[PDB]
Every structure is written in C-alpha cells, then in structure tokens.
Amino acid sequence: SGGIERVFTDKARYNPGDAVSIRVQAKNGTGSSWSGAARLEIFHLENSVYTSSQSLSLTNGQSTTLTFTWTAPSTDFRGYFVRIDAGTLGQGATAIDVSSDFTKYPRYGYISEFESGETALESKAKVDQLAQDYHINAWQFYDWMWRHDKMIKRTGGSIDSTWLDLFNREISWSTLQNQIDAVHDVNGKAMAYAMIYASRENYSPLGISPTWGIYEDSSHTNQFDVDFGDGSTYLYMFDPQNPNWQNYIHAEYIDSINTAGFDGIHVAQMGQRSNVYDYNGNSIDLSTRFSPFLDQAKSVLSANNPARDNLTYNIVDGTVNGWAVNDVSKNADLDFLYSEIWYLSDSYNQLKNYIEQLRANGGNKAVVLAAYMNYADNAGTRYEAESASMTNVSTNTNHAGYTGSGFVDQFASTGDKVSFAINAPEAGDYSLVFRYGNNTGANSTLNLYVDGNFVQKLYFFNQSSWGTWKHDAWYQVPLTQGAHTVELRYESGNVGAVNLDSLTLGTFDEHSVRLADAMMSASGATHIELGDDNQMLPHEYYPNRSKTMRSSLKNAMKDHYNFITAYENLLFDSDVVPNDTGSQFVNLTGVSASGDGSANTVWYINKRTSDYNIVHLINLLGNDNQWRNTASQPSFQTNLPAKIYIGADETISDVYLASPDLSGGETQELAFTSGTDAGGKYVSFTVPELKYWNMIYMLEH
Numbered sequence: 001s002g003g004i005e006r007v008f009t010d011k012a013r014y015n016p017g018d019a020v021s022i023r024v025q026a027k028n029g030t031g032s033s034w035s036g037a038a039r040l041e042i043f044h045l046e047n048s049v050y051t052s053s054q055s056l057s058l059t060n061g062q063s064t065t066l067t068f069t070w071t072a073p074s075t076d077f078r079g080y081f082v083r084i085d086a087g088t089l090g091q092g093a094t095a096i097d098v099s100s101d102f103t104k105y106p107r108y109g110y111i112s113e114f115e116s117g118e119t120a121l122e123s124k125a126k127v128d129q130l131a132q133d134y135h136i137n138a139w140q141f142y143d144w145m146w147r148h149d150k151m152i153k154r155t156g157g158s159i160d161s162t163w164l165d166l167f168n169r170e171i172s173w174s175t176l177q178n179q180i181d182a183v184h185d186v187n188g189k190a191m192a193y194a195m196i197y198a199s200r201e202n203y204s205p206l207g208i209s210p211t212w213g214i215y216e217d218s219s220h221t222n223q224f225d226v227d228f229g230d231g232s233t234y235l236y237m238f239d240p241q242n243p244n245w246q247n248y249i250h251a252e253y254i255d256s257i258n259t260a261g262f263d264g265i266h267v268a269q270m271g272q273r274s275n276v277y278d279y280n281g282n283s284i285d286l287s288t289r290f291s292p293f294l295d296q297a298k299s300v301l302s303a304n305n306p307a308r309d310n311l312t313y314n315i316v317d318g319t320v321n322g323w324a325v326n327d328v329s330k331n332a333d334l335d336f337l338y339s340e341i342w343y344l345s346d347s348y349n350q351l352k353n354y355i356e357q358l359r360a361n362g363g364n365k366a367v368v369l370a371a372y373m374n375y376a377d378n379a380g381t382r383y384e385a386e387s388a389s390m391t392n393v394s395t396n397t398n399h400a401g402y403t404g405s406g407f408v409d410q411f412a413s414t415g416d417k418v419s420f421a422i423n424a425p426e427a428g429d430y431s432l433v434f435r436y437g438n439n440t441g442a443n444s445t446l447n448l449y450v451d452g453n454f455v456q457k458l459y460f461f462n463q464s465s466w467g468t469w470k471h472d473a474w475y476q477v478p479l480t481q482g483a484h485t486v487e488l489r490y491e492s493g494n495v496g497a498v499n500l501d502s503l504t505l506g507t508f509d510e511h512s513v514r515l516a517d518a519m520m521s522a523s524g525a526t527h528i529e530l531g532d533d534n535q536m537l538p539h540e541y542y543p544n545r546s547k548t549m550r551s552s553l554k555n556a557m558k559d560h561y562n563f564i565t566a567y568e569n570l571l572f573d574s575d576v577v578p579n580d581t582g583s584q585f586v587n588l589t590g591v592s593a594s595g596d597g598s599a600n601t602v603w604y605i606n607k608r609t610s611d612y613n614i615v616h617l618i619n620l621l622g623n624d625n626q627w628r629n630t631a632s633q634p635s636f637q638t639n640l641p642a643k644i645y646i647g648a649d650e651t652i653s654d655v656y657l658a659s660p661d662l663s664g665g666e667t668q669e670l671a672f673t674s675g676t677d678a679g680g681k682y683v684s685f686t687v688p689e690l691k692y693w694n695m696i697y698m699l700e701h
C-alpha cells in the first residue's frame with residue numbers, strides 16, 4: 001500500500017457542523033505512470049455514511065496531496081473510521097472525532113520542552129504531528145512554570161521572556177505561547193501542570209505561611225517535603241483544605257489561565273503520605289482533603305471562564321480501593337479522571353479491574369492512565385562493553401549481575417576509553433543507554449562522543465555496592481541510517497570511576513506496548529504516552545528520553561489511535577459497561593482461553609452498550625500476565641473458530657470484527673450461526689485473524 005503515504009485531517013477534533021479537510025499524501029513508486037481513482041469512504045461503526053472519489057494520475061516517482069472535504073454530521077460525540085482506496089497504488093486510513101468537548105473522549109499527550117531556539121514553525125510542526133498521527137486533543141504542559149508557587153516569572157508587572165525551572169532548564173515564554181497557539185489551531189486544549197499543595201524552598205518572602213502547611217508531627221516541627229538531593233531545591237507541602245492556601249494557589253491557577261492562555265489545570269500530587277498533621281497539631285487524613293480543594297478550584301475556574309475551566313487530578317499509585325481512589329473518583333468535580341499506576345496493579349486483570357472501578361465511581365467519566373511502559377527494563381538492542389574497543393581498561397567478571405561474558409572495570413583516569421560500533425537500522429533518534437556500576441561514594445562522569453564529536457558529559461550515580469547495576473545514564477541523539485561510533489572517554493575534568501556493562505539502544509518494546517494499550521482501551525481507558533516531537537513517555541519526569549519508538553511502533557500507534565478514535569463510541573461512551581453477570585463464556589477451538597487475563601491464553605473481555613454485545617480478544621498466547629514489562633511477539637492465529645454464549649434474553653442480528661492490527665482498523669462483517677445446547681444460547685463464527693487485539697461488536701436489533 002506504499003503509494004498512499006499519509007492520510008490525516010487538519011484538526012484533532014471537530015464540532016458538529018465543522019468542515020473537515022481530509023488530506024491524502026500519495027506517491028507513485030510502481031515504476032511507471034499510474035492513472036486511476038482515489039476513493040474515500042467514512043464509516044460510523046458498521047455503517048457507511050459518506051463516499052466520494054477523485055481521479056489521480058501520477059508520473060513515475062511523482063507525489064501529490066489530495067483533499068476531500070466533508071461536513072461533520074450533527075450528532076455530537078461520534079467517532080468515524082476513514083478509508084482511502086487507490087487501487088493498485090495502495091490504500092490508507094485515518095479517523096475523525098466529532099465532539100464539542102474533548103473531556104468525553106480525551107486523547108491526552110504532553111509537551112515538556114520550551115527552548116528559546118524553537119521557532120513558531122517548529123512548535124507548530126510538533127503539535128501538528130501528534131494531532132495528525134494520533135488525534136491528540138489535549139496536551140499536558142509539563143514543567144513549564146518558574147516555581148510551583150509562582151508559576152509565571154515577572155519583573156515588576158512585566159513577564160520575563162525566559163526563566164530557569166527547578167532543574168535549571170531554560171523555559172522560553174514565546175516558545176510556550178507558540179505551542180499553546182498551535183494546540184488551539186488543531187482544536188486542542190492546553191492543560192497546565194500544577195501541584196495541588198507544593199511551594200518551593202524559601203517561600204515566606206512570597207507571603208506564604210508555614211501555618212498553612214502539613215506536618216509530619218503534631219508540633220509543627222517537620223513540614224512534609226520533597227528533597228531533590230542538592231541541599232537547596234525542595235518542594236514543601238501544604239494542606240489542600242486550608243482556605244488560605246486555596247486562596248493563594250487558586251489565584252496562581254487563574255493567573256496561568258488568564259495570562260498564559262491555558263484551557264485548564266492538570267493538578268498533580270506526590271501520593272500517599274501517612275500520619276499527617278496541620279500546623280496546630282490536629283491529626284488529619286490527607287486522602288479526603290483533595291476533593292474539597294478540587295471542587296473549590298473548579299468553582300473559581302468556571303466562574304473565571306467557562307471555556308477554560310478544565311480540571312483533572314492525578315490519583316497516584318492506582319489500584320482497586322487505593323489511597324484517595326474512592327474519595328477523588330466519587331466526590332471531586334473533575335472533567336475526567338487521571339491516575340498514575342505504580343506497582344499495585346501489576347497484572348492485566350488487576351489493572352482492568354481498577355479502570356472499571358474508576359469508570360463506575362465517576363459515573364462513566366473518561367479515564368486516562370499514566371503507566372510508563374518498560375519502566376524497569378533496559379529494553380533495546382544491546383552492545384556488550386566487553387565486546388567493544390577499549391583503551392587503558394580491560395574486562396572483568398568479579399561482581400555478579402552483569403550481562404554477557406563480563407564488563408569493563410577501572411574506568412577511572414584520563415586516556416581511558418570505550419568505543420562501541422553500532423548500527424542504526426533507520427534514520428532518527430536513538431537513546432544511548434549505559435548499564436553501569438559506581439560505588440566510589442560520589443557521582444562519576446564520562447564524556448560522550450558520537451562519530452568523533454563530543455556530545456555531552458554524562459553522570460553516573462553512586463550506588464551502594466559494586467554489584468549494584470543501573471541503567472539510568474543515557475542521552476538521546478539523532479543518527480543517520482547505518483554505522484556509527486559511540487564513545488565514552490575519561491578525560492581531563494571527569495571524576496570518579498565506573499564499571500561499564502553495556503550500551504543499549506533504548507527502545508520501547510512494540511509487543512508489550514500494543515498489548516498494554518489494547519488492554520487499557522478494551523477496559524475503558526486511554527493512556528498518556530505520546531508528546532513533544534513524537535516521543536513516547538519512558539518515566540514520570542516527562543523530558544526523559546531514555547527510550548525511543550522505532551518506526552514499526554510508530555505505525556502501530558497510528559493504527560491504535562485511529563482505532564480508539566473511530567470506535568470511541570464502543571469503548572468510552574457512558575453507555576459502555578461491563579457485561580460481567582450471567583456466567584458468560586467464550587470458547588475457542590485449538591487455543592487456551594481465559595476470562596481473567598491469564599498467561600498464555602486468549603483473553604476475552606465482555607462489554608456492552610444498549611445496542612451491541614461486545615467481546616474483546618486480547619492475545620496473550622506466549623506471554624505472561626504483567627502489563628508493563630517487555631514481551632515477545634504473540635502467537636498469531638488464523639481461522640480461529642469461536643463461540644460466544646449470550647443471555648437467552650439476546651438475539652444477534654449481525655457480527656462485526658475490527659482490529660487496529662487488520663487493515664487499519666476497518667470493520668469486517670462475519671457470517672455466523674446461532675444455536676443452543678447444554679451451555680446455553682450461543683452464536684458461532686470463525687475469526688480470520690488474531691494478532692494482538694480484536695474487537696467483536698455484535699448488533700442486537
């Protein structure tokens with residue numbers, strides 16, 4: 001299908017009645033002149049709702065961009081699938097969301113970089129790329145602010161043109177305003193990251209009072225804090241129910257909306273803290289104190305500007321009945337729910353049950369998860385340090401836990417070097433990740449050279465023994481396709497020493513990422529995972545680029561995001577509920593099945609709306625039951641016979657199967673038969689292909 005290179009729209013979301021411009025980028029590479037038609041067809045679920053055609057002739061090697069126009073139908077909150085057929089030139093797909101309000105079907109991305117060198121054109125391109133490729137309709141702006149308690153830096157009444165954030169990055173006001181403008185141009189919303197309860201160090205000259213603080217004891221001796229490890233930089237924590245702190249920080253939220261032009265506030269927190277006291281020594285349960293803060297915040301935001309009053313709150317460490325889970329999801333006036341998952345919902349099934357709880361508690365508000373894929377894994381192509389070209393250092397095996405046949409030791413003085421000969425299979429960004437040991441008692445440093453040029457000085461953190469390997473020393477660089485040299489040098493001005501195990505081209509595992517996203521969306525949530533210039537999120541610190549997506553995963557993500565936009569009505573509507581009572585059952589011939597996301601099975605998940613019986617098949621054949629870690633390619637299946645049991649209450653008019661894995665998400669209608677036996681009333685068919693994820697939607701009269 002390689003002639004049709006891109007299919008996309010001008011915006012990420014449309015109001016009913018809007019003109020939608022569908023673009024088709026085509027290039028003739030058949031080796032000789034081509035003449036024919038490009039045929040557009042738009043579907044809402046199983047139903048075709050628009051078709052149109054344009055003739056197309058291209059000389060060998062010739063490219064062009066067609067435009068089809070369409071008016072968004074008048075029914076609000078509907079997703080559409082888009083097919084482009086150009087015959088022998090190939091085909092393509094995209095999707096369209098018609099929604100007056102993104103908080104119904106949020107597709108959340110992020111921006112975390114605000115360099116002054118970034119032009120308005122480049123800011124537009126990075127927003128356009130996410131909007132066009134994935135229909136991202138909201139961006140979380142991460143670490144834009146000057147201080148947590150003084151977000152826009154001013155000299156007198158004048159906004160400073162740049163400022164340094166808490167890690168000393170330079171934030172450009174003009175770059176930030178350009179990005180916000182670009183987001184608004186695609187009908188996106190810009191959400192400002194802000195803490196619920198943080199000031200920075202030395203807060204009293206800003207008129208903030210310790211008497212508004214939360215404390216670790218009843219004598220106001222130690223205020224809860226966050227220690228960034230340099231002996232100066234901290235956050236201090238405050239009581240979200242305190243009316244003075246609310247006054248203070250809600251005014252900063254408002255300033256951010258009105259001055260910077262944000263469309264809402266993404267309210268963050270640090271997560272569970274125990275045995276909390278106010279300044280006067282009253283014992284308080286912090287977990288029930290967010291909801292009153294958030295209700296009040298929503299009130300002043302909505303009063304200030306009903307169009308820029310969006311609000312969510314991070315439920316940190318999400319799990320069924322987790323800390324603050326019930327109080328927030330049930331009582332807080334939020335537009336959608338957001339939760340960062342750590343280690344309390346490690347299996348696919350646990351995480352499914354948590355999403356389900358959030359959906360039920362919130363009255364089927366939208367749910368977005370932050371769930372950093374491959375977080376603990378040194379995923380990617382590995383080059384063993386002991387197999388590299390090393391100067392004035394030699395190999396060893398005398399501390400356990402190394403990969404390969406050993407590691408490089410005593411990397412500790414001027415003239416020492418290790419040079420890796422790597423290959424980039426495609427042009428693009430590469431995360432260069434070093435697994436190392438350092439027990440010198442302080443940070444150690446080395447200079448990084450790529451193809452003979454100095455790129456950065458890198459820091460290698462002190463660990464607690466020499467048998468303690470880490471892989472948090474990394475740097476991302478652009479590489480051309482083919483051979484390169486990556487070199488670490490101990491030069492003048494470097495300090496300490498390291499053991500070096502390996503270099504890895506830090507890469508998100510395509511397989512795990514597809515399974516996790518399928519699981520989440522089939523359960524009823526989306527996933528904040530894409531941001532900046534086509535980065536995927538590796539870590540809670542969003543500017544982290546310790547892993548990169550390769551092209552094969554970028555395509556799978558385009559398909560996935562096309563799929564969750566096109567079928568948003570079947571995945572995320574307030575209609576959509578679990579179909580969990582009745583002993584409902586799926587039988588697959590030749591493969592192990594399971595209803596609870598067991599290892600090495602095809603998982604079925606049962607959902608429904610008033611019109612459809614929906615069955616998701618998620619293919620864990622050949623893989624474990626953990627969602628975050630790396631995975632192998634699933635055992636793909638062909639012509640899989642299936643039979644789905646249904647309440648005798650139900651009669652099924654049609655069987656439809658759509659998958660982001662198959663023909664871009666396009667629905668196929670399947671022939672099926674009904675019957676009855678010992679197991680109850682059933683329907684039966686052949687699934688032609690299961691790779692990662694199939695959604696079966698079956699129409700009921």
Ligand SMILES: OC[C@H]1O[C@H](OC[C@H]2O[C@H](OC[C@H]3O[C@H](OC[C@H]4O[C@H](OC[C@H]5O[C@H](OC[C@H]6O[C@H](OC[C@H]7O[C@@H](O)[C@H](O)[C@@H](O)[C@@H]7O)[C@H](O)[C@@H](O)[C@@H]6O)[C@H](O)[C@@H](O)[C@@H]5O)[C@H](O)[C@@H](O)[C@@H]4O)[C@H](O)[C@@H](O)[C@@H]3O)[C@H](O)[C@@H](O)[C@@H]2O)[C@H](O)[C@@H](O)[C@@H]1O
Nearest residue numbers: 143226227228229268269270271272314316317340540541
């Ligand atoms: O995402 C929140 C939180 O999630 C996980 O921890 C949850 C657990 O917390 C408690 O147990 C862990 C540990 O927590 C404390 O110390 C943590 C950490 O503190 C210092 O480093 C802080 C971070 O510094 C970098 O991040 C910079 C950003 O800091 C702030 O943002 C934090 C996050 O807010 C989230 O809401 C959001 O989703 C996320 O994107 C943000 O990154 C700030 O607002 C931003 O402006 C900054 O950019 C660094 O990159 C992070 O890794 C650090 O967390 C110290 O230097 C570091 O050494 C500490 O580990 C307690 O002090 C400690 O006692 C406790 O053991 C709680 O007990 C558990 O129940 C709960 O599950 C992550 O593991 C954690 O890292 C993260 O902050």
Ligand SMILES: OC[C@H]1O[C@H](OC[C@H]2O[C@H](OC[C@H]3O[C@H](OC[C@H]4O[C@H](O)[C@H](O)[C@@H](O)[C@@H]4O)[C@H](O)[C@@H](O)[C@@H]3O)[C@H](O)[C@@H](O)[C@@H]2O)[C@H](O)[C@@H](O)[C@@H]1O
Nearest residue numbers: 399408409410411412439440441442466495496497498499
């Ligand atoms: O005590 C103050 C000094 O401590 C820090 O430097 C510590 C060492 O760093 C490098 O060596 C790294 C090396 O460390 C261990 O090796 C221990 C011994 O092993 C052999 O006996 C060897 O012959 C000796 O050199 C060494 O003492 C780990 O087991 C090994 O895997 C590591 O690679 C330097 O090369 C050493 O000279 C240091 O002792 C601190 O950074 C220094 O500034 C301080 O002087």
Ligand SMILES: [Ca+2]
Nearest residue numbers: 403404406501
């Ligand atoms: Ca090794």
Ligand code: NA
Nearest residue numbers: 624626629631
């Ligand atoms: Na897994």
